[PDB]
Amino acid sequence: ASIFRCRQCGQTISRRDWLLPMGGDHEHVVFNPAGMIFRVWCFSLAQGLRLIGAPSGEFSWFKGYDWTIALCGQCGSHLGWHYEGGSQPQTFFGLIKDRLAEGPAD
């Protein structure tokens, strides 16, 4: 089983087997209105995160879902976002691939 950890501190976050094909693919290369560019990978489940702020629909990369910022719960690195449906209760995470390290369970 392949595991995703926080690249900064090694906190365990998610699993390759939780990748989620939102819109057809887990990977979305996106930018926010301020011009920050991210390679986002969608996961159905994740742990080790602290969510901050209120949910927002602003410029959501996944139509019909609102986002909340997700930090590493250990080190405070910005690891991505939590998404929740605006009209149904599904949830998932969009995590910044380059802020994760993928490797074996060990």
Query: Which residues in the chain are followed by a discontinuity, with C-to-N distance exceeding 2.5 angstroms?
Result: none
Residue 32 vs 47, nearer CB to ligand JP5? 32
Decide which of ligand JP5, Zn ion, none touches 74; Cβ closer than 5 to 8 Å per partner kind.
Zn ion
Burial (CB count <10 Å: 0-12, 13-18, 19+), residue 69: middle
Residue 36 vs 105, nearer CB to ligand JP5? 36
Residues 10-39 that bind Zn ion (CB under 5 A): 11
The residue ranges that bind Zn ion (CB under 5 A) are 6, 8-9, 11, 72, 74-75, 77
